[PDB]
């Protein structure tokens, strides 16, 4: 059984949008994997990505940003995503994400060329809506929506260095 949603993106130029999309996904019901909230300091990185990509990732989301098509890491994740989508023989595994208008359609890496990249440039609400309805028309297993998990995650990671401490001053 695979139900996790993988998001591949560049760092740190795509922190806010990836965080917002991951929070909306995890509050909407879908389980989402992203390196912002899972891959932290002190742990190994690559083995977990490979294992989750070829073991429990149901859909792959690659951000086709301006800086997201030339970094080595995103291209390597795209390569292993291509390998696992060839093994799984599903063309709907990779769902590209385009967020920058300044990047033309002809300058992207090749695995984004064949697939029609999703729309997230001029607006985000309808983009999330079409991503959601494409997901539920692709029959991804889901849980009932609850923002309590999203609230707990948001209080967990994004409030680690931005809170008052109990020290004498």
């Amino acid at each position: 059984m695979r139900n996790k949603i993988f998001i591949s993106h560049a760092t740190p130029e795509d922190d806010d949008f990836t965080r917002w999309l991951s929070l909306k996904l995890i509050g909407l019901g879908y389980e989402v994997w992203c390196d912002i909230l899972f891959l932290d300091k002190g742990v190994d990185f690559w083995s977990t990505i490979e294992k989750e990509i070829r073991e429990n990732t149901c859909k792959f989301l690659i951000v086709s940003s301006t800086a997201g098509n030339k970094r080595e890491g995103v291209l390597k994740e795209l390569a292993v995503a291509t390998k696992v989508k060839k093994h799984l023989q599903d063309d709907m595994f990779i769902i590209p994400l385009a967020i920058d208008e300044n990047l033309s359609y002809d300058d992207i890496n090749i695995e984004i060329v064949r697939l029609n990249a999703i729309d997230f440039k001029k607006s985000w609400a309808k983009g999330l809506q079409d991503l959601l309805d494409a997901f539920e028309k692709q029959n991804v297993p889901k849980k009932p929506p609850d923002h309590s998990k999203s609230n707990l995650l948001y209080q967990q990671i994004f409030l680690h260095d931005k809170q008052a401490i109990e020290k004498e001053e």
Partner: protein, 465 residues
């Protein structure tokens, strides 16, 4: 040896019953509590103002960034933050001829120019919304920069007020039209420079805050509620009472008091306190004579009964002046025996600058200094770690609170006014020094004092901010 007790940062509700502490991030993550179906923008101004507004609205439609999201968070787009749709179509536009501006320019005294221009905008808006079938939820007055500059009250080449938007909202109050005035240089700073060759209205790094404030003001004036307060007890009513005085020449100012009221949500039900020709401006101690005091209390009680059906168990009164005995005695006997009445005074003129030994950091916002049971201090300004910056400037200054009469817990009113400081709607800042019942107080007093000719102002808030 005394210490400084801590009050926790108050929380604001959001969509799906979610609790956060920042309004911008909570809106970007969850959104409003209640959804509206859609807004329709209306604009008055020149065609240059029309295209400037269209450019700024389509820029707002795009997700725009700032330097960093730690202090000034990025704008995820109006649709993604509010769930409402903004479009550049179905927009009603009314043009103002610049030749009429030239005709009105060469007048001698700028006051009559202000009057004729304000009335021209007013009856243009009235004509526009009284004939056009397309509903306009919010009218956007795009005033030109040179009108704001060259037609100032002291610009050099009685109940009417020289301020433009003051008179605008004052004479638009009698028709229930939510309007918001937009300065041209605010949303046309790209092509606006100073004489040296620099934008004095510069937003090369900070325009995300402008987008945030404009978007939340547009959603609030539409009818939807952006955010509310978390915990409100069954039977507590806040009464932020205005005690701002105008300097209305030989006309008797006396007491131009008004009152804000928060009862169950962020809903403000402002009922017009009397002008009260008693105690002519030689007597400006704000001592409310008993008939007007009981009238205002009856207004508050009737509004609470209409909105809640139940008698309130405790009335919270916020003001800024000292309270005399007879005013509270008049406040007492009208109230039932079960309820409680307490009055709080908030002031800024008391100096207390708390400095820091090491580093260059100010007082963290939320510290409470207690002097006695009656008097206390609250540091609503200063550093806040969720922002990783100070909301104040240089050194923060606290608000000296003091309960006059009635029995209540001091930390209760401390945390309650701390929660009340988070409900600012016109500006989407994290928090302000004065509470929003006192922040809206001066502006709504200026609105009401600009038009004596009205008698029943609407008690909503869209026609004020």
């Amino acid at each position: 040896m005394k210490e400084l007790i801590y009050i926790e940062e108050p929380s604001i509700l959001f969509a799906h019953g979610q609790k956060c502490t920042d309004p911008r991030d909570g809106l970007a993550l969850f959104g409003p509590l209640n959804q509206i179906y859609g807004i329709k923008s209306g604009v008055v101004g020149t065609q240059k103002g029309l295209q400037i507004f269209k450019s700024y609205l389509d820029k707002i439609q795009k997700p725009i960034y700032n330097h960093n999201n730690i202090t000034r968070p990025m704008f995820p787009g109006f649709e993604a933050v509010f769930g409402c749709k903004w479009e550049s179509q179905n927009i009603v536009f009314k043009e103002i001829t610049d030749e009429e501006i030239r005709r009105y320019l060469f007048n001698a005294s700028t006051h009559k120019r202000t009057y004729d221009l304000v009335t021209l905008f007013n009856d243009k808006i009235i004509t526009a919304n009284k004939n056009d079938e397309e509903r306009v939820d919010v009218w956007f007055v795009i005033v030109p920069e040179e009108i704001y500059k060259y037609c100032r009250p002291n610009s050099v080449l009685y109940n009417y007020d020289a301020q433009f938007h003051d008179q605008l909202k004052a004479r638009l109050l009698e028709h229930t039209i939510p309007t918001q005035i937009l300065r041209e240089s605010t949303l046309a700073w790209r092509d606006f420079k100073n004489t040296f060759g620099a934008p004095i209205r510069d937003f090369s790094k900070i325009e995300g805050h402008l987008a945030w404030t404009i978007s939340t003001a547009a959603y609030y004036k539409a009818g939807g509620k952006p955010w509310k307060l978390g915990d409100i007890r069954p039977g507590v009513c806040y009464l932020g009472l205005v005690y701002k005085k105008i300097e209305k020449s030989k006309n008797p100012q006396n007491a131009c008091c008004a009152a804000q009221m928060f009862l169950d949500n962020g809903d403000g039900t402002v009922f017009k306190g009397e002008v009260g020709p008693w105690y002519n401006p030689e007597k400006g101690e704000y001592h409310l004579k008993p008939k007007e005091a009981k009238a205002l209390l009856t207004q508050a009680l009737e509004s609470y009964k209409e909105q809640n059906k139940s008698y309130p168990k405790e009335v919270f009164i916020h003001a800024r002046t000292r309270f005399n005995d007879e005013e509270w005695n008049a406040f007492n006997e009208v109230t039932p025996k079960n309820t409680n009445l307490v009055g709080v005074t908030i002031t800024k003129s008391k100096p207390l600058k708390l400095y820091k030994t090491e580093g260059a950091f100010p007082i963290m916002r939320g510290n409470a200094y207690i002097v006695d049971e009656k008097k206390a201090f609250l540091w609503t300004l200063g550093f806040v770690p969720k922002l990783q910056s100070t909301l104040s400037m240089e050194v923060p200054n606290p608000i000296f609170i003091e309960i006059n009469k009635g029995e209540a817990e001091i930390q209760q009113v401390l945390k309650d006014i701390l929660a009340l400081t988070k409900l600012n709607y016109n500006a989407c800042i994290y928090a302000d020094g004065e509470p929003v019942t006192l922040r809206f107080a001066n502006k709504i007093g200026e609105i009401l004092t600009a038009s004596t000719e009205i008698k029943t102002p609407p008690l909503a808030f869209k026609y004020y901010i």
